[PDB]
Amino acid sequence: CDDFLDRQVPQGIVTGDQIASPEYVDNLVISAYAIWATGDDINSSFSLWNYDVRSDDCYKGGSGTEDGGVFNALEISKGINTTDWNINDIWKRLYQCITRANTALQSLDQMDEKTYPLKNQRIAEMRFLRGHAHFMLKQLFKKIVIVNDENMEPDAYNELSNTTYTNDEQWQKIADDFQFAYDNLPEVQIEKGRPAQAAAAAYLAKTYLYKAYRQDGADNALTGINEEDLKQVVKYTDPLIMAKGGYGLETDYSMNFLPQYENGAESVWAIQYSINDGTYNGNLNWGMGLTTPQILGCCDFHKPSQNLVNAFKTDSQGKPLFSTYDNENYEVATDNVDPRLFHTVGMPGFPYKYNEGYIIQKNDDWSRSKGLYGYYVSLKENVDPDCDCLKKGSYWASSLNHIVIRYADVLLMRAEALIQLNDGRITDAISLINEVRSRAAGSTMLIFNYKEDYGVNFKVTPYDLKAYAQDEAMKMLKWERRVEFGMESSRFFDLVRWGEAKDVINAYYVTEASRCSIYKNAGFTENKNEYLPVPFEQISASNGNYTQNFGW
Amino acid sequence: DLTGAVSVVKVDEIQKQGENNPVKALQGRVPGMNITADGNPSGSATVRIRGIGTLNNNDPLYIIDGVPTKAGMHELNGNDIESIQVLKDAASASIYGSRAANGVIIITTKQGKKGQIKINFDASVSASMYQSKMNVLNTEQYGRAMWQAYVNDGENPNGNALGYAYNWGYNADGNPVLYGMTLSKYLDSKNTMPVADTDWFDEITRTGVIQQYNLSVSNGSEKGSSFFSLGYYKNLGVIKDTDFDRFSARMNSDYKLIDDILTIGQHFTLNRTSEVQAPGGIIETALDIPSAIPVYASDGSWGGPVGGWPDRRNPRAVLEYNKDNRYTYWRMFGDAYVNLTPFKGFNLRSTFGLDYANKQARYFTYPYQEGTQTNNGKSAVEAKQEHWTKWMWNAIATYQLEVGKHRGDVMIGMELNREDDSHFSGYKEDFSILTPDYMWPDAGSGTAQAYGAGEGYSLVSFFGKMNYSYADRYLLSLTLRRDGSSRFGKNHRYATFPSVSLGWRITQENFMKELTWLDDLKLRASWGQTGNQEISNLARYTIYAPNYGTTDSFGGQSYGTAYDITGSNGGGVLPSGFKRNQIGNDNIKWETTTQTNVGIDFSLFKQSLYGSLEYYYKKATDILTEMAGVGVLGEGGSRWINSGAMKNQGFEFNLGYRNKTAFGLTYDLNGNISTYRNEILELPETVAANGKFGGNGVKSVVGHTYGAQVGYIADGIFKSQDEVDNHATQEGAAVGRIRYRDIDHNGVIDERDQNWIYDPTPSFSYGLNIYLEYKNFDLTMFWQGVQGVDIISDVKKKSDFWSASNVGFLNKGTRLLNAWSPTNPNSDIPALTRSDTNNEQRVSTYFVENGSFLKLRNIQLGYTVPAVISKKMRMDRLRFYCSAQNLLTIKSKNFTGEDPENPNFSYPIPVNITFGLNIGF
Amino acid sequence: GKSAVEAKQEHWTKWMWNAIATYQLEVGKHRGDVMIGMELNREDDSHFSGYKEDFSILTPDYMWPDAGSGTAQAYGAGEGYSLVSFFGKMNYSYADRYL
Amino acid sequence: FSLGYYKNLGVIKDTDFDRFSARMNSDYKLIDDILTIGQHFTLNRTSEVQ
Numbered sequence A: 001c002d003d004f005l006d007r008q009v010p011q012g013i014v015t016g017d018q019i020a021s022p023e024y025v026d027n028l029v030i031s032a033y034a035i036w037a038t039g040d041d042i043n044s045s046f047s048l049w050n051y052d053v054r055s056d057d058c059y060k061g062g063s064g065t066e067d068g069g070v071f072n073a074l075e076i077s078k079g080i081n082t083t084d085w086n087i088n089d090i091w092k093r094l095y096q097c098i099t100r101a102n103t104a105l106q107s108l109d110q111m112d113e114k115t116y117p118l119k120n121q122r123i124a125e126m127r128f129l130r131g132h133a134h135f136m137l138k139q140l141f142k143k144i145v146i147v148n149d150e151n152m153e154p155d156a157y158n159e160l161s162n163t164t165y166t167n168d169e170q171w172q173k174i175a176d177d178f179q180f181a182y183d184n185l186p187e188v189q190i191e192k193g194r195p196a197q198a199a200a201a202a203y204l205a206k207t208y209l210y211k212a213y214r215q216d217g218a219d220n221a222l223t224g225i226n227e228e229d230l231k232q233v234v235k236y237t238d239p240l241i242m243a244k245g246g247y248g249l250e251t252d253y254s255m256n257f258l259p260q261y262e263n264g265a266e267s268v269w270a271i272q273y274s275i276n277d278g279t280y281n282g283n284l285n286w287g288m289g290l291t292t293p294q295i296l297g298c299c300d301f302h303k304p305s306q307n308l309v310n311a312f313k314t315d316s317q318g319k320p321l322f323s324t325y326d327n328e329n330y331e332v333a334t335d336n337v338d339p340r341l342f343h344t345v346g347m348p349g350f351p352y353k354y355n356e357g358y359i360i361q362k363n364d365d366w367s368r369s370k371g372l373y374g375y376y377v378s379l380k381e382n383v384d385p386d387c388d389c390l391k392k393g394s395y396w397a398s399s400l401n402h403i404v405i406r407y408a409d410v411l412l413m414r415a416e417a418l419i420q421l422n423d424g425r426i427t428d429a430i431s432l433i434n435e436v437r438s439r440a441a442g443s444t445m446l447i448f449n450y451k452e453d454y455g456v457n458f459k460v461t462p463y464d465l466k467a468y469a470q471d472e473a474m475k476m477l478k479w480e481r482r483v484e485f486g487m488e489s490s491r492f493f494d495l496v497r498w499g500e501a502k503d504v505i506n507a508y509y510v511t512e513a514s515r516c517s518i519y520k521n522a523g524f525t526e527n528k529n530e531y532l533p534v535p536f537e538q539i540s541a542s543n544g545n546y547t548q549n550f551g552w
Numbered sequence B: 001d002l003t004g005a006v007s008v009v010k011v012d013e014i015q016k017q018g019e020n021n022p023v024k025a026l027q028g029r030v031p032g033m034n035i036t037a038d039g040n041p042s043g044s045a046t047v048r049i050r051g052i053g054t055l056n057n058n059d060p061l062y063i064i065d066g067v068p069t070k071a072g073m074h075e076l077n078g079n080d081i082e083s084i085q086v087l088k089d090a091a092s093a094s095i096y097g098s099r100a101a102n103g104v105i106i107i108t109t110k111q112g113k114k115g116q117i118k119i120n121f122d123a124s125v126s127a128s129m130y131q132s133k134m135n136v137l138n139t140e141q142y143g144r145a146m147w148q149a150y151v152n153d154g155e156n157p158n159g160n161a162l163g164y165a166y167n168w169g170y171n172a173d174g175n176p177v178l179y180g181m182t183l184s185k186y187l188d189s190k191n192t193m194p195v196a197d198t199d200w201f202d203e204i205t206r207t208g209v210i211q212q213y214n215l216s217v218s219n220g221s222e223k224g225s226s227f228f229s230l231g232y233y234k235n236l237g238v239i240k241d242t243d244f245d246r247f248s249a250r251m252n253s254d255y256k257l258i259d260d261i262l263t264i265g266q267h268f269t270l271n272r273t274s275e276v277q278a279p280g281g282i283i284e285t286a287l288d289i290p291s292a293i294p295v296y297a298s299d300g301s302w303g304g305p306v307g308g309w310p311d312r313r314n315p316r317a318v319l320e321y322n323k324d325n326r327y328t329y330w331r332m333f334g335d336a337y338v339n340l341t342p343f344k345g346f347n348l349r350s351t352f353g354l355d356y357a358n359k360q361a362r363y364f365t366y367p368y369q370e371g372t373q374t375n376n377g378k379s380a381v382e383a384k385q386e387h388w389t390k391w392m393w394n395a396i397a398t399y400q401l402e403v404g405k406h407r408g409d410v411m412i413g414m415e416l417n418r419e420d421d422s423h424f425s426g427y428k429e430d431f432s433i434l435t436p437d438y439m440w441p442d443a444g445s446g447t448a449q450a451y452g453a454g455e456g457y458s459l460v461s462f463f464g465k466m467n468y469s470y471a472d473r474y475l476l477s478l479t480l481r482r483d484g485s486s487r488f489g490k491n492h493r494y495a496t497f498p499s500v501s502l503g504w505r506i507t508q509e510n511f512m513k514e515l516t517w518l519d520d521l522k523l524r525a526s527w528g529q530t531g532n533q534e535i536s537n538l539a540r541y542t543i544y545a546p547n548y549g550t551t552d553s554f555g556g557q558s559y560g561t562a563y564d565i566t567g568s569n570g571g572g573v574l575p576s577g578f579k580r581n582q583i584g585n586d587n588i589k590w591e592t593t594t595q596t597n598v599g600i601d602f603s604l605f606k607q608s609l610y611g612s613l614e615y616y617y618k619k620a621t622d623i624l625t626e627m628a629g630v631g632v633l634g635e636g637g638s639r640w641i642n643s644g645a646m647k648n649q650g651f652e653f654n655l656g657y658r659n660k661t662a663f664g665l666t667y668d669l670n671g672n673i674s675t676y677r678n679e680i681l682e683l684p685e686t687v688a689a690n691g692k693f694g695g696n697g698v699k700s701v702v703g704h705t706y707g708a709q710v711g712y713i714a715d716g717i718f719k720s721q722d723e724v725d726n727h728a729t730q731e732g733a734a735v736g737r738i739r740y741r742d743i744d745h746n747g748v749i750d751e752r753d754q755n756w757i758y759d760p761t762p763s764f765s766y767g768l769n770i771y772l773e774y775k776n777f778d779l780t781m782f783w784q785g786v787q788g789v790d791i792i793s794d795v796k797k798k799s800d801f802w803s804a805s806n807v808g809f810l811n812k813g814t815r816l817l818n819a820w821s822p823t824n825p826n827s828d829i830p831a832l833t834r835s836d837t838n839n840e841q842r843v844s845t846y847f848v849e850n851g852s853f854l855k856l857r858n859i860q861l862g863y864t865v866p867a868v869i870s871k872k873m874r875m876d877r878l879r880f881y882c883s884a885q886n887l888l889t890i891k892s893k894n895f896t897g898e899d900p901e902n903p904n905f906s907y908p909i910p911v912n913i914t915f916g917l918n919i920g921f
Numbered sequence C: 001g002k003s004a005v006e007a008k009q010e011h012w013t014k015w016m017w018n019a020i021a022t023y024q025l026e027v028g029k030h031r032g033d034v035m036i037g038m039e040l041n042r043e044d045d046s047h048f049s050g051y052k053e054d055f056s057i058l059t060p061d062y063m064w065p066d067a068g069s070g071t072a073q074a075y076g077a078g079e080g081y082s083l084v085s086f087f088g089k090m091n092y093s094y095a096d097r098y099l
Numbered sequence D: 001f002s003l004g005y006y007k008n009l010g011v012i013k014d015t016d017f018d019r020f021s022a023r024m025n026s027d028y029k030l031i032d033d034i035l036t037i038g039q040h041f042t043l044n045r046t047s048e049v050q
């Protein structure tokens, strides 16, 4: 009667009661890291590259405009629906990174320090993770729900709103998590997947840099650049913070995208993709699953643009062609080029990721688009085909860390807040841009031979150190970020921060319709397309709580 | 049950479709009972009683020889069935078990009769041919089409990196017209794939053979009886490398001890079924791959795409490579009982049933390499094992009493149920020999993975039910249940489900002395509630699983807890943890279907012209519902909750005419026609915007039929540029494209322009059996129809646009050879284009079609060698017959596919031609 | 701190078919039986097994193969044999005296 | 028709054995006593920790 319906208990799971336990607390912090390598999928790389197709760095690529149609629409800024499955996707996905970081914190809050000497260091790790999610989430959507109450009960999540805080108070909440991390993270983390203190400082400084170009008006246009914020970018990129955790610029530019040089001194914080590791095919970077070129039979997404390729040209003395670079294509015999081109972009006639036996061609063997999306290939996230680190599951994936913060990113974030403060520190932004620039100048290991073999002419020199105008120094900073971080999916995000998106990519739309048919119907709509729409399924379920962005 | 709502089945007609599955024969035989199945050789179906009862499981409950089971019928011997009644309202079914909500099918197997030693041998053999051959472009049509789509866009039609070279120009009006065309001998630059013109549906299909043999033996003494059935079935499906077989044995027996007081008996069936099944989505692959791809390469190998052809695989390869993935299934089923009669009218009997199945299989991964369609060189094997061990025990007391005027029966008792499942599996990679002989787990060189879990549930159920009849004139019945369940916490375990029913046999009221033309006429009315607990064995709980990452996952997103926290790059075991799979609900209770049913029976001249009609109001409340989480809740926010409700009203009518004619011919009719409306009343808010049950997540399904859908409206196609400019501003519209309606007249076509465009319900379904019997010869036809049903065509995306598909250059149906252009303006089909700029894939009225039909589900013709000739062979029964199943279909002119009963991608329903006999001593 | 579980499964599927003919005859003095026939046998075996290590809860309830954090191993093979056998045997008895 | 159960708790602690058993045998004599048809059949679930 009663002995009978209590006998059958659940198998192979841990229950709501038990997961609190201290025995499991460190399982939850790992599980919370895991989802960064195991929660994305081929259309939702926590690289946000699917969504960086909007930019002038690249096209989506693939079979054609119906191979991922919702991402075409983002690429031309026409046709985007708020129902679109992809936007609901990334929105749901990043909030489930958060639940892991939050469940860990709900258990870690109950721990006692005298018997768990790490307690706070572990809380900081989890909080850092939590900011990473909100940050990217904020980048995608602007008007996001802050989930920072780890002891909040399930039914409390319907009474949440993405307008509880204001667009700046929302940015400050992301900083509150990164700030805490700075205070309590170790100086050096020996378990390299855990962020160290300089990583929290880096992401914190990144958060302020995005918080300072303010949009306190009701639309997405800029309402000034907050002085007090930029002064916090410089604080938490102080060379002394970074030197305590040993980070710096790699000797040769290419190391940040090779698997032998994983976890370098420029890898400030990086997702630890792994192989031969207990899992089914391995914790490979499935997110880049589609960007492998046709030479593996699929799929040919994430193709760099003729805009970006020409962006690597330089003039007689080795400086970019700010005005004219994009008026005739790069031709290797006669133009001067930044080495960084042959680290970012695998072009026809050249080796595929430094393997002189895979030569790339305007061919069924490399591009899937029959010419539509061009014939360029992304090199950063792809690897040598003979790598021990590549493996075909359902797509071709590898063990190559995605670096969330390259140390070059902190030097350019520092040089940026310097140039915006305009307080006579401009000669230091230039020294910063010059570090990034003359490393690139001599990043010819793995491509040393490219002159005699192909006639390429590397010319890249650092800028003379005068007291540049705020704006004239700005374009040299903007150009350095364009060539340093090509195809790493934080380009379009650069522009929406600057309030420049509608202008440069609508201009990219018409220069690049010559090179890529798809951009012929394209139109970026000011105060609308700077941000993905908040997903309609979320809005409609919140009962008027959640609020759309200006434009829909 | 004389007060219920009970469709009875003529089990004789059942075998005249030669189905393996008895339920597949009942298709359309019973009003209100929608039986639905594809053409696959196991005959497996799904039953739906009275619309769509609830939001979780709608599968009915079978009670075979007193034992419950919710699965099978296609796993058992349909040939040793003797009785089948479907019980449709809450009252008649409510007492047969704790799971009646979705209807209750009583099934009674054969057994020996007092004083008889009969024996029957039945034996059949059929051929099955592919009916619904979907017409897809050949290598030259695919050439004409691609030229059109290329020019319609004004780019050079020779810029195809395929083997095509064109010869074209402009006519008088300056329109693109095509003259001739030339094609390469080889599809790729290295000349390793010949260009071909294959008919992939001719290739992947064969002529199936079906085959059945049953042997029944009986024996009946006064002190007990016994039965013994033997039987085999073998169906080679119409898809190559798919088959099914069943071996079956049943032994039933009873013993009458201690005069005829103490009785002891047992039913028991034994079954080994075995199958290799069609792979997931081969029909869609066969639609997609161009004719130009050859079955085989220049060398021996299988053909695939090379150079510039689409990302689609070899359908003859996949069907071969999967030819060895055979499960084999052993299901023991039966009961045992004791029955005591301490004094006349009072019986104490208790049954004990056993339903145990095990299912072994080895699934083989071989390396493939058709064209650019690689696998690397993966080899692996997975040895899966599964167990379901169900058992039931009950005990029953019954006193019947006839006062003199009156009659009355009483029953009380209790029932116990416990399913205990498990399943485990060993997977290993790398094999130096790729045969099922070498490919065992000890022969592996590579990595392995282990998998396996278990679960179960126990059921307790106290019940009573009581009857009465004044004097064959006025009939009452009442039932009261108290059902508990393992799935719920202590605070909601047991609910209480009472039911009432009435009946008035108006003909025995000799106030109808007069009317002689009318033998019976009976008015009955039901009200009852039936509990539903058919939910996850883990619904109550908050589920944290450790999920390392060890399982296959597509495109990523394994949601694994393991992570290289050390930066190792792996090589060794990683630290891991726990993810959340769900969130608890302490307060889940039963869901309750309440069914109210009214009906009348009747019987007219000589008891020819018989039938019955019924009207129900079926309502499920406190519906148990897998309630999606809120977005910001994130991972594993699903939880079970009793939020939701749904109703189901309708009419069920069966009516048949018997009579002989004086010239030897006998003719017997048996039609039936149902209808019903289904509406969702309430629903939690996440389930609403989920669209899970209807809204496509644009609108909410509350107020509409379960599965209703929302989309745009296809006002034809733009025919000239001024219909575009005067239309609402619509992104990507031009002369050629589909015009979409402006439903809020805001002057722009955006996503707000969608309304309810699909309702899956039929405006009435029906079926009719005709029997003719003239001078030994017997002929039977069973028709079945469904008029009113809407149908969402996903094939139309492949037959009406060069680019309503995610990847370029797929094969496309034949229809687009008839698309619009300047040159051909008498067509609905929008002009070919290479790019879907008008998003013609969006949910349109374009894809909603009249899927109504009437099929000749079966036709049979036989001869019965008269007893004079057969009985010198010393035989009671000698009959030869021959049948056709699904021989012919009739459908709407505005339906573009082949089989409207299966428009898209499921296993084609084939046409069977059958031969057989019935020896019977 | 080893924990692990191994889920083993084994199958033996043996079957036999034979057919027999027998004529017995009582002459009057004598008696005699004759039998001929054939028999077929086929055993087909198999056995397979999944093994996994590491369990955060050490009960038969938690300790299934999906709950494992550690390394796994798979095992399993099959084998069999078929038998054919033609036979006869014949009897006699003079008169309950000599058999 | 045979039904039967056995349960032996061994003399070593944490060792036992059980057996559930069912047998149904039956013959039929058809066509006077010429044609005969029959079946024997036993069903068993044994379970042990050794």
Ligand SMILES: OC[C@H]1O[C@@](CO)(OC[C@H]2O[C@@](CO)(OC[C@H]3O[C@@](CO)(OC[C@H]4O[C@@](CO[C@]5(CO)O[C@H](CO)[C@@H](O)[C@@H]5O)(OC[C@H]5O[C@@](CO)(OC[C@H]6O[C@](O)(CO)[C@@H](O)[C@@H]6O)[C@@H](O)[C@@H]5O)[C@@H](O)[C@@H]4O)[C@@H](O)[C@@H]3O)[C@@H](O)[C@@H]2O)[C@@H](O)[C@@H]1O
Residues within 6 Å of the ligand: A041, A042, A043, A044, A062, A063, A066, A067, A068, A069, A085, A089, A298, A299, A394, A395, B280, B281, B282, B284, B285, B288, B311, B312, B313, B554, B555, B806, B807
């Ligand atoms: O349309 C609404 C629909 O979108 C969904 C699901 O599709 O999004 C949710 C969720 O699903 C994904 C991934 O799981 O959807 C994939 C999505 O990505 C795109 C572009 O974004 O590109 C996919 C590319 O993959 C390929 C690769 O094929 C491979 C190569 O390694 O070759 C064979 C052939 O498939 C495979 O073994 C390999 O994967 O295609 C896979 C893609 O194509 C589809 C088309 O149905 O599968 C092909 C299969 O379909 C069949 O017809 C029937 O099974 C067979 O012919 C064949 O097996 C689709 O199921 C697969 O996802 C390459 O061709 C593509 O370039 C889009 O094209 C694609 O839609 C994620 O985006 C997202 O997170 C749901 O919400 C909703 O159901």
Ligand SMILES: [Cl-]
Residues within 6 Å of the ligand: A015, A016, A017, B541, B542, B584
């Ligand atoms: Cl719980």
Ligand SMILES: [Mg+2]
Residues within 6 Å of the ligand: B742, B743, B744, B745, B746, B747, B748, B749, B750, B752, B753
């Ligand atoms: Mg509108």
